[PDB]
Symmetry: C2
Subunit: 67 residues, 2 copies
C-alpha cells in the first residue's frame, strides 16, 4: 500500500499520551508513542511506533531501550 493524499482536518484523536506524540508512517496524522516493552511494528507500524530511545524488536516486534 502506498499512501493517498492527506488532510489535517480528517485525523482522529489518540487522547493524551505519556511517552510522546508522532506522525503516521506517511507522516500525515499524529499518533501516540508506544512505551517501553509495549507492542509495535506490523504492517504500517499499525501495532505501534517506539518512543525515542526505544527500538521495535521482533521475535512485528516490541519496544526496548537501546544503550
Amino acid at each position: 500500500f502506498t499512501c493517498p493524499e492527506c488532510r489535517p482536518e480528517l485525523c482522529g484523536d489518540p487522547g493524551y499520551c505519556e511517552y510522546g506524540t508522532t506522525k503516521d508512517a506517511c507522516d500525515c496524522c499524529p499518533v501516540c508513542f508506544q512505551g517501553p516493552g509495549g507492542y509495535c511494528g506490523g504492517p504500517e507500524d499499525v501495532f505501534g511506533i517506539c518512543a525515542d530511545g526505544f527500538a521495535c524488536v521482533p521475535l512485528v516486534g516490541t519496544c526496548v531501550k537501546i544503550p
Copy 2:
C-alpha cells in the same frame, strides 16, 4: 502475513473511547473506534476503524449508516 499470539497485559493503553472499544488487528490489543468523518482503513485499518453503524467511505472516511 499473519498474526502471532500475544500478551494481553502488554497491549498499550488506547484511552477513553468516545465511540467505543474493539480488538486488535491480531485480535489481541484493544482499540478505539474511529468517529464519523475520521480517517478510515488503509492497510489493516491502520488509518482507522469505523464504529458499528459507520462505514469506510473512500482509504476512506467513516460515514453513518442510516
